[PDB]
């Protein structure tokens, strides 16, 4: 490499010191309030005073910024200088203020956090430094002055690099720019660990859950035409979906469930891959909302399912799950909606669960497949597992009464599974 | 899982045989026994903070390598016994050093454009050229135009190549008589 | 009356052969018919517009 | 006799000056008229408000000549209404795209 | 009948939509403050 | 750290895969086909005209091309070499339509009617010399019949005994399909739509054990359609209209047994799901006939608009999945559309198909295998990989 | 639409489709309510086809009030749909108002059509 | 070639020389080099003289 390269990398590394007065103008007078001729004049206790009161107003819509009255924003960091100490206080309070920005990105609409953010901006050097982190936590409010705001005064990432041309521009970045944004493989890894953070200290606000959802089932559109580009993304989407399912807000799970709809609709998963988020998605359903939302995706994931297989009894773990988690009037109420979802596969995949794992609640399949009409294939298999029940067990009025109403409907199909199997007289003789 | 590196052997000469990283070194060393040995080098992070957790995909550094089959023609390139020609049955047509192993060179298969305009044929998903019967090399005129001419099992046509860009001709010779060719010359 | 019929009906065909001109201009497949005269013709290829 | 005219004279329907000069000389037409005064138009920035002055003005005229020409209307905005949903969503389609390669 | 048995498993088919390029592109307009169910069933409209 | 609702994230740590396999699909995926190209099936012999007609064989690997150099050539297929099996050239008859009948009783007749711009129809009785036949006798009805060119081959039942006899039907001048006996050449029975009579399918459905019924369906220019019985007399059951479309050239049904995926035994009788009115403007109007029999004025499904000229082929694969939409009129202008979901496959055809100007196509019975004739004299041959 | 006055029968409005075929291949027609408008403005129109399938049909039932001050005859066709295949375009079209030629190769199927429309006025 | 270094009298800059011909002057701190010429004759070695401003 050549000297001017490997100068540009050593003037990278010392971004951020004041060397001579020009440079510590140019450098302080990079503000988040004001602008360039009254940041310059501006001192460090006087931005500290007025950042000090907007933390004690935000401190009291939201109690969680106290500690940082006491590490961040106390008196002893007027005079701690970000780049005098080693490697170790250095990480120590980059990660202060990474628990900063991400309990304060969702406050990014009342002007406290602007004016208490400032003196991050302008201390501890947080738009050149702690840049990423800054992007990130603030991307949701891209349509808006604070974050054209932090644009203009930012030093953009190599993986933010489509912002490029909106830097220091009177327009805001467009959506088509954020899908383009997010169209990346790193840009995905990236977005993904920052919201494992959020999940982990419980900060998703349901903002940043809509215009992540957003993003990620635009990516996934994007891609719907490539197959190794969607198989590259599976691992991604489908970790963050199960990291999701994994929390506690009924926002961020119905997050999931959409991510998880949209991506099973957009290519074939494996059944096992679908079986699996189905135990992920009951393995922590409280809400309601969330349990919509969870019969909706259930059943749309059962439906985007082919192949020899798809409607097979859904074994005992997961059916006994998902009877804990839905019982009976809940799945024959959602059918009688006059809206009329496709539940095809996934109410023959639960009435041959209950053949083979209920034995009971058979009165209940008879009323919920009178309800929802259902296709020739779905019905056979219907038959031929009560055909086998009759023939385990005594046959009595509930199964009698089943094949009443299979006689009642297409009874020359009923003939041929008794005549691919059995006969209609010994049949009859049986029950 | 960070990522897979697919087909970086031949599974029917025993798939990837070592693979070492050098010690201290974002650097891997793989060999196969499909007579080949390559290093592939993991970037720093693209994320300057995070890095961690978006780990680049480890990308091709150098390589050796021969011929994975018993090679089925030689040929001696010049008369100063540096270069010889080898063509193999696993489709290949090598350059080999007799002086110095690093500048053995697989010559290349990228066809050249049509001289009139129109497309070529073939199949999309590109295989390489069927396996060297026979090969005449003449370097009188070397890179002023085509220098190797070779000819193919069981196909109606011989290539031409260029020793010196070491890649294929823009030209093929039919036989007109829908007969392979058995045989190929050229003169000095 | 009669000077500004004759000034319309001469705008009016000056006008024709103008947007018979730009029409031929345009694109799609054409062909140049001509008939018994030499007054030539374009009949466009029956095609439609994507 | 505003519902009889075409959406291109809805569109100009203001700048007859410097529509007729820009006619009697052959010199480009003006686009805004006086449909430019419209919310819409507000909204719009570039040379895509001439584009959302047209469609804008096609609007307009459909909406126009329903409410002059309907017998059966309802004084309740329903045609304006949709007619308007369809202009925002192109306004917002043609504002969502950007000349800059990202 | 193993034939007849395939075609009606082929013929029990229904249509369903696909996702384009740009089928989810007009919803950045209307995430604005509107709850996380809204944009939920927003969404399964498009996919039915 | 660590030694050895977490279902998702295992069954992803597992997994290196993420679609289904092989063989689980058992349907097609839509948007991305898989279709590789074989050697051009007329490559051994050429042809010296455009290629009109082609048609597969029900049981046999023949293909039958035939073309406006009054010959017709059978060309036993395979991948690799595609030999020419024998051919026939009838002198002084250009030949527009060719088609390999079988009947349904023995299913060991193996006739070949052919046909061009004549007032005959040769039928040839394959023997493996040569034995043909020609129809020339409209009986009585010549004035309407004045050019055998458009027929198609069906099946019919009696209907008071159980025995099932070819018809080939021919379409005439003014609104007229004549139906005949194909080993009597006797005229059965007409049926007269009003219009320009344009094109017609037929479609079949089962009525009990070894019971069917045969509707002719028929298109006028315009866009109305009649459907006749004609198991019973030639007499209308349905005539209704297609939504939109106004210069009609095309009607196919497809997704059962049609007259080219034909049934080799009367019990494997389909009903056909679908129905594709092709148009002059490159429109396909496509119905679902599980649900537009009823309506009297059916909407379409979908009207594809992909191809801009006018469609001269439009055939369904014998299981019903794909159509393909051609025209004879540009080059290259072939479409395999997807359906249920009625959605053009992407990635086929690309730029560089040597399609030629497609002047007839037809699909496999079995193989799942494409041969598109050209306007130069080719038929090119491809494999989908999903069979 | 009961108000869509002289509506065409199908032998009728098959054969004014078909004017209207051959006329978009010769660029003879303006396609679409405004052009159709204009045309009428300007006094070069031979006759005006509309569709009765629009669901405002007032949108249309304006150019009927200046083809009677005009007196350009003007018909209905059931379907907006067809109109636009026959027109030649990928949309549904309205309106299409076929334009006077006296050179015209199908002149006489333009005037035995237009004859054909002003007999049910 | 090798490397003849020199520091202005104060640590600002940075003038460096290779035996071949490359001579540079830098603000090594920073980033900014502000002479990077290439006389194609061997120098041996360079000095600032009362500045960053002119070096011998």
Same mark, same amino acid.
């Given at each position: 490499?050549?000297?001017?390269?490997?100068?540009?990398?050593?003037?990278?590394?010392?971004?951020?010191?004041?060397?001579?007065?020009?440079?510590?103008?140019?450098?302080?007078?990079?503000?988040?309030?004001?602008?360039?001729?009254?940041?310059?004049?501006?001192? @460090?206790?006087?931005?500290?005073?007025?950042?000090?009161?907007?933390?004690?107003?935000?401190?009291?819509?939201?109690?969680?910024?106290?500690?940082?009255?006491?590490?961040?924003?106390? =008196?002893?960091?007027?005079?701690?200088?970000?780049?005098?100490?080693?490697?170790?206080?250095?990480?120590?309070?980059?990660?202060?203020?990474?628990? @900063?920005?991400?309990?304060?990105?969702?406050?990014?609409?009342?002007?406290?956090?602007?004016?208490?953010?400032?003196?991050?901006?302008?201390?501890?050097?947080?738009?050149?430094?702690?840049?990423?982190?800054?992007?990130?936590?603030?991307?949701? @409010? @891209?349509?808006?002055?604070?974050?054209?705001?932090?644009?203009? $005064?930012?030093?953009?990432?190599?993986?933010?690099?489509?912002?490029?041309?909106?830097?220091?521009?009177?327009?805001?970045?467009?959506?088509?720019?954020?899908?383009?944004?997010?169209?990346?493989?790193?840009?995905?890894?990236?977005?993904?660990?920052?919201?494992?953070?959020?999940?982990?200290?419980?900060?998703?606000?349901?903002?940043?859950?809509?215009?992540?959802?957003?993003?990620?089932?635009?990516?996934?559109?994007?891609?719907?035409?490539?197959?190794?580009?969607?198989?590259?993304?599976?691992?991604?989407?489908? =970790?963050?979906?199960?990291?999701?399912?994994?929390?506690?807000?009924?926002?961020?799970?119905?997050?999931?469930?959409?991510?998880?709809?949209?991506?099973?609709?957009?290519?074939?998963?494996?059944?096992?891959?679908?079986?699996?988020?189905?135990?992920? $998605?009951?393995?922590?359903?409280?809400?309601?909302?969330?349990?919509?939302?969870?019969?909706?995706?259930?059943?749309?994931?059962?439906?985007?399912?082919?192949?020899?297989?798809?409607?097979?009894?859904?074994?005992?773990?997961?059916?006994?799950?998902?009877?804990?988690?839905?019982?009976?009037?809940?799945?024959?109420?959602?059918?009688?909606? =006059?809206?009329?979802?496709?539940?095809?596969?996934?109410?023959?995949?639960?009435?041959?669960?209950?053949?083979?794992?209920?034995?009971?609640?058979?009165?209940?399949?008879?009323?919920?497949?009178?309800?929802?009409?259902?296709?020739?294939?779905?019905?056979?298999?219907?038959?031929?597992?009560? $055909?086998?029940?009759?023939?385990?067990?005594?046959?009595?009025?509930?199964?009698?009464?089943?094949?009443?109403?299979?006689?009642?409907?297409?009874?020359?199909?009923?003939?041929?599974?008794?005549?691919?199997?059995?006969?209609?007289?010994?049949?009859?003789?049986?029950? | 899982?960070?990522?897979?590196?697919?087909?970086?052997?031949?599974?029917?000469?025993?798939?990837?045989?070592?693979?070492?990283?050098?010690?201290?070194?974002?650097?891997?060393?793989?060999?196969?026994?499909?007579?080949?040995?390559?290093?592939?080098?993991?970037?720093?992070?693209?994320?300057?903070?995070?890095?961690?957790?978006?780990?680049?995909?480890?990308?091709?550094?150098?390589?050796?390598?021969?011929?994975?089959?018993?090679?089925?023609?030689?040929?001696?390139?010049?008369?100063?016994?540096?270069?010889?020609?080898?063509?193999?049955?696993?489709?290949?047509?090598?350059?080999?050093?007799?002086?110095?192993?690093?500048?053995?060179?697989?010559?290349?298969?990228?066809?050249?454009?049509?001289?009139?305009?129109?497309?070529?044929?073939?199949? %999309?998903?590109?295989?390489?050229?069927?396996?060297?019967?026979?090969?005449?090399?003449?370097?009188?005129?070397?890179?002023?135009?085509?220098?190797?001419?070779?000819?193919?099992?069981?196909?109606?046509?011989?290539?031409?190549?260029?020793?010196?860009?070491?890649?294929?001709?823009?030209? %093929?010779?039919?036989?007109?008589?829908?007969?392979?060719?058995?045989?190929?010359?050229?003169?000095? | 009356v009669?000077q500004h019929l004759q000034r319309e009906t001469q705008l009016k065909q000056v006008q024709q052969r103008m947007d018979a001109q730009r029409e031929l201009l345009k694109?799609?497949?054409?062909?140049?018919?001509?008939?018994?005269?030499?007054?030539?013709?374009?009949?466009?290829?029956?095609?439609?517009?994507? | 006799s505003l519902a009889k005219s075409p959406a291109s004279t809805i569109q100009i329907l203001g700048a007859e000056k410097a529509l007729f000069r820009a006619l009697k000389t052959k010199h480009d037409t003006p686009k805004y008229g006086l449909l430019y005064h419209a919310?819409?138009v507000?909204?719009?920035?570039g040379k895509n408000k001439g584009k959302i002055a047209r469609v804008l003005a096609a609007?307009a005229a459909?909406?126009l000549r329903?409410?002059?020409?309907?017998?059966?209307?309802?004084?309740?905005?329903?045609?304006?209404?949709?007619?308007?949903?369809?202009?925002?969503?192109?306004?917002?389609?043609?504002?969502?795209?950007?000349?800059?390669?990202? | 009948?193993?034939?007849?048995?395939?075609?009606?498993?082929?013929?029990?088919?229904?249509?369903?939509?696909?996702?384009?390029?740009?089928?989810?592109?007009?919803?950045?307009?209307?995430?604005?403050?509107?709850?996380?169910?809204?944009?939920?069933?927003?969404?399964?409209?498009?996919?039915? | 750290?660590?030694?050895?609702?977490?279902?998702?994230?295992?069954?992803?740590?597992?997994?290196?895969?993420?679609?289904?396999?092989?063989?689980?699909?058992?349907?097609?995926?839509?948007?991305?086909?898989?279709?590789?190209?074989?050697?051009?099936?007329?490559?051994?012999?050429?042809?010296?005209?455009?290629?009109?007609?082609?048609?597969?064989?029900?049981?046999?690997?023949?293909?039958?091309?035939?073309?406006?150099?009054?010959?017709?050539?059978?060309?036993?297929?395979?991948?690799?070499?595609?030999?020419?099996?024998?051919?026939?050239?009838?002198?002084?008859?250009?030949?527009?339509?060719?088609? *390999?009948?079988?009947?349904?009783?023995?299913?060991?007749?193996?006739?070949?009617?052919?046909?061009?711009?004549?007032?005959?129809?040769?039928?040839?009785?394959?023997?493996?010399?040569?034995?043909?036949?020609?129809?020339?006798?409209?009986?009585?009805?010549?004035?309407?019949?004045?050019?055998?060119?458009?027929?198609?081959?069906?099946?019919?039942?009696?209907?008071?005994?159980?025995?099932?006899?070819?018809?080939?039907?021919?379409?005439?001048?003014?609104?007229?399909?004549?139906?005949?006996?194909?080993?009597?050449?006797?005229?059965?029975?007409?049926?007269?739509?009003?219009?320009?009579?344009?094109?017609?399918?037929?479609?079949?459905?089962?009525?009990?054990?070894?019971? *069917?019924?045969?509707?002719?369906?028929?298109?006028?220019?315009?866009?109305?359609?009649?459907?006749?019985?004609?198991?019973?007399?030639?007499?209308?059951?349905?005539?209704?209209?297609?939504?939109?479309?106004?210069?009609?050239?095309?009607?196919?049904?497809?997704?059962?047994?049609?007259?080219?995926?034909?049934?080799?035994?009367?019990?494997?009788?389909?009903?056909?799901?679908?129905?594709?009115?092709?148009?002059?403007?490159?429109?396909?109007?496509?119905?679902?006939?599980?649900?537009?029999?009823?309506?009297?004025?059916?909407?379409?499904?979908?009207?594809?608009?992909?191809?801009?000229?006018?469609?001269?082929?439009?055939?369904?694969?014998?299981?019903?999945?794909?159509?393909?939409?051609?025209?004879?009129?540009?080059?290259?202008?072939?479409?395999?559309?997807?359906?249920?979901?009625?959605?053009?496959?992407?990635?086929?055809?690309?730029?560089?198909?040597?399609?030629?100007?497609?002047?007839?196509?037809? *699909?496999?019975?079995?193989?799942?295998?494409?041969?598109?004739?050209?306007?130069?004299?080719?038929?090119?041959?491809?494999?989908?990989?999903?069979? | 639409?009961?108000?869509?006055?002289?509506?065409?029968?199908?032998?009728?409005?098959? +054969?004014?489709?078909?004017?209207? +075929? +051959?006329?978009?291949?010769?660029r003879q027609l303006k396609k679409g309510a405004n052009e159709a408008t204009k045309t009428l403005n300007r006094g070069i129109s031979?006759?005006?086809?509309?569709?009765?399938?629009?669901?405002?049909?007032?949108?249309?039932?304006?150019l009927?009030?200046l083809?009677?001050d005009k007196?350009?005859?003007?018909?209905?066709?059931?379907?907006?749909?067809?109109?636009?295949?026959?027109?030649?375009?990928?949309?549904?079209?309205?309106?299409?108002s076929?334009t006077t030629n006296?050179?015209?190769?199908?002149?006489?199927?333009?005037?035995?059509?237009?004859?054909?429309?002003?007999?049910?006025? | 070639?090798?490397?003849?270094?020199?520091?202005?009298?104060?640590?600002?800059?940075?003038?460096?020389?290779?035996?071949?011909?490359?001579?540079?002057?830098?603000?090594?701190?920073?980033?900014?080099?502000?002479?990077?010429?290439?006389?194609?004759?061997?120098?041996?070695?360079?000095?600032?003289?009362?500045?960053?401003?002119?070096?011998?």
């Open positions: 490499s050549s000297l001017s390269d490997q100068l540009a990398q050593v003037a990278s590394n010392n971004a951020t010191v004041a060397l001579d007065r020009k440079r510590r103008q140019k450098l302080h007078s990079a503000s988040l309030i004001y602008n360039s001729k009254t940041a310059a004049t501006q001192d @460090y206790d006087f931005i500290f005073e007025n950042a000090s009161k907007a933390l004690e107003e935000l401190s009291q819509i939201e109690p969680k910024f106290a500690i940082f009255s006491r590490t961040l924003f106390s =008196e002893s960091s007027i005079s701690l200088d970000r780049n005098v100490q080693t490697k170790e206080e250095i990480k120590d309070l980059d990660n202060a203020i990474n628990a @900063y920005l991400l309990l304060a990105s969702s406050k990014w609409y009342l002007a406290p956090t602007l004016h208490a953010t400032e003196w991050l901006v302008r201390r501890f050097q947080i738009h050149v430094k702690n840049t990423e982190m800054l992007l990130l936590s603030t991307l949701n @409010y @891209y349509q808006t002055p604070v974050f054209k705001r932090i644009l203009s $005064i930012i030093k953009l990432p190599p993986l933010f690099n489509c912002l490029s041309n909106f830097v220091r521009s009177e327009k805001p970045p467009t959506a088509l720019t954020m899908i383009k944004l997010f169209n990346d493989m790193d840009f995905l890894k990236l977005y993904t660990s920052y919201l494992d953070q959020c999940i982990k200290h419980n900060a998703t606000y349901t903002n940043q859950l809509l215009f992540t959802t957003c993003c990620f089932i635009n990516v996934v559109a994007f891609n719907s035409n490539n197959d190794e580009k969607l198989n590259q993304l599976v691992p991604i989407l489908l =970790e963050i979906s199960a990291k999701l399912l994994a929390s506690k807000s009924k926002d961020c799970q119905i997050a999931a469930h959409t991510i998880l709809v949209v991506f099973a609709t957009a290519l074939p998963l494996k059944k096992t891959i679908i079986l699996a988020a189905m135990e992920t $998605i009951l393995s922590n359903l409280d809400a309601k909302e969330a349990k919509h939302s969870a019969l909706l995706t259930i059943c749309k994931l059962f439906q985007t399912l082919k192949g020899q297989g798809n409607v097979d009894q859904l074994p005992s773990k997961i059916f006994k799950l998902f009877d804990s988690k839905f019982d009976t009037v809940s799945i024959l109420t959602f059918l009688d909606k =006059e809206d009329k979802p496709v539940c095809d596969k996934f109410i023959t995949s639960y009435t041959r669960s209950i053949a083979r794992y209920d034995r009971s609640k058979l009165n209940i399949i008879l009323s919920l497949l009178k309800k929802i009409r259902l296709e020739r294939y779905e019905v056979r298999l219907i038959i031929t597992d009560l $055909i086998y029940l009759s023939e385990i067990l005594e046959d009595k009025s509930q199964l009698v009464e089943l094949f009443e109403y299979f006689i009642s409907i297409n009874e020359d199909l009923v003939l041929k599974c008794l005549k691919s199997l059995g006969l209609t007289g010994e049949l009859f003789e049986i029950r | 899982r960070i990522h897979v590196l697919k087909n970086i052997h031949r599974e029917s000469y025993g798939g990837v045989t070592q693979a070492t990283f050098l010690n201290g070194q974002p650097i891997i060393v793989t060999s196969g026994g499909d007579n080949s040995l390559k290093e592939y080098v993991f970037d720093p992070s693209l994320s300057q903070g995070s890095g961690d957790v978006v780990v680049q995909p480890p990308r091709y550094l150098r390589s050796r390598g021969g011929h994975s089959q018993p090679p089925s023609y030689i040929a001696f390139a010049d008369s100063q016994s540096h270069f010889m020609l080898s063509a193999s049955k696993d489709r290949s047509l090598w350059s080999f050093s007799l002086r110095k192993d690093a500048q053995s060179q697989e010559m290349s298969q990228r066809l050249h454009k049509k001289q009139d305009g129109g497309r070529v044929g073939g199949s %999309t998903i590109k295989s390489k050229f069927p396996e060297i019967v026979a090969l005449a090399i003449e370097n009188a005129r070397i890179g002023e135009w085509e220098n190797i001419i070779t000819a193919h099992k069981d196909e109606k046509f011989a290539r031409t190549w260029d020793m010196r860009n070491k890649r294929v001709g823009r030209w %093929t010779f039919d036989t007109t008589d829908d007969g392979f060719v058995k045989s190929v010359a050229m003169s000095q | 009669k694109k799609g497949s054409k062909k140049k018919i001509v008939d018994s005269s030499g007054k030539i013709s374009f009949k466009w290829k029956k095609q439609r517009k994507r | 919310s819409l507000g909204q719009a920035t609007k459909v909406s329903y409410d002059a020409l309907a017998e059966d209307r309802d004084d309740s905005g329903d045609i304006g209404l949709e007619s308007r949903a369809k202009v925002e969503n192109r306004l917002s389609q043609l504002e969502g795209r950007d000349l800059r390669t990202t | 009948d193993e034939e007849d048995i395939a075609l009606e498993f082929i013929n029990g088919e229904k249509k369903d939509k696909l996702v384009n390029m740009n089928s989810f592109t007009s919803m950045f307009d209307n995430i604005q403050n509107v709850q996380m169910d809204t944009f939920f069933d927003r969404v399964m409209k498009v996919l039915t | 750290d660590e030694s050895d609702i977490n279902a998702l994230t295992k069954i992803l740590s597992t997994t290196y895969n993420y679609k289904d396999t092989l063989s689980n699909s058992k349907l097609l995926p839509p948007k991305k086909l898989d279709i590789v190209r074989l050697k051009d099936a007329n490559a051994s012999h050429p042809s010296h005209s455009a290629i009109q007609s082609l048609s597969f064989h029900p049981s046999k690997p023949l293909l039958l091309t035939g073309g406006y150099d009054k010959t017709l050539r059978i060309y036993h297929i395979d991948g690799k070499t595609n030999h020419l099996v024998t051919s026939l050239h009838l002198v002084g008859s250009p030949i527009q339509t060719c088609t *390999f009948y079988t009947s349904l009783s023995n299913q060991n007749q193996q006739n070949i009617f052919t046909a061009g711009r004549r007032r005959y129809m040769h039928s040839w009785d394959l023997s493996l010399t040569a034995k043909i036949e020609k129809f020339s006798r409209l009986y009585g009805h010549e004035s309407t019949q004045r050019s055998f060119e458009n027929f198609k081959v069906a099946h019919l039942q009696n209907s008071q005994t159980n025995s099932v006899h070819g018809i080939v039907l021919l379409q005439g001048n003014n609104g007229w399909i004549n139906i005949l006996h194909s080993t009597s050449g006797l005229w059965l029975m007409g049926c007269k739509i009003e219009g320009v009579i344009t094109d017609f399918c037929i479609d079949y459905q089962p009525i009990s054990r070894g019971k *069917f019924r045969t509707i002719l369906i028929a298109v006028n220019a315009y866009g109305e359609v009649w459907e006749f019985d004609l198991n019973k007399n030639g007499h209308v059951i349905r005539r209704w209209k297609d939504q939109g479309g106004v210069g009609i050239t095309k009607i196919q049904v497809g997704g059962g047994t049609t007259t080219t995926c034909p049934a080799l035994q009367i019990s494997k009788i389909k009903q056909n799901r679908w129905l594709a009115v092709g148009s002059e403007s490159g429109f396909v109007n496509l119905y679902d006939r599980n649900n537009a029999m009823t309506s009297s004025t059916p909407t379409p499904v979908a009207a594809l608009d992909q191809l801009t000229t006018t469609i001269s082929n439009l055939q369904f694969s014998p299981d019903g999945q794909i159509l393909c939409m051609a025209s004879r009129a540009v080059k290259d202008a072939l479409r395999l559309v997807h359906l249920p979901s009625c959605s053009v496959f992407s990635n086929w055809p690309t730029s560089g198909t040597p399609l030629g100007k497609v002047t007839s196509v037809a *699909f496999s019975p079995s193989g799942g295998l494409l041969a598109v004739g050209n306007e130069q004299g080719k038929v090119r041959l491809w494999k989908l990989n999903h069979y | 639409n009961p108000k869509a006055f002289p509506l065409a029968d199908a032998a009728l409005t098959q +054969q004014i489709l078909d004017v209207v +075929q +051959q006329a978009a291949n010769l031979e006759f005006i086809i509309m569709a009765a399938d629009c669901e405002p049909i007032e949108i249309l039932l304006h009927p009030l083809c009677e007196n350009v005859p003007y018909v209905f066709v059931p379907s907006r749909v067809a109109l636009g295949r026959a027109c030649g375009v990928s949309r549904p079209v309205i309106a299409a076929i006296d050179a015209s190769a199908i002149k006489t199927q333009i005037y035995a059509v237009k004859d054909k429309i002003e007999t049910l006025l | 070639g090798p490397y003849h270094i020199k520091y202005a009298k104060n640590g600002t800059h940075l003038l460096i020389t290779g035996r071949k011909g490359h001579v540079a002057s830098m603000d090594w701190r920073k980033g900014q080099l502000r002479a990077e010429l290439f006389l194609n004759e061997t120098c041996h070695s360079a000095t600032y003289l009362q500045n960053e401003q002119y070096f011998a």
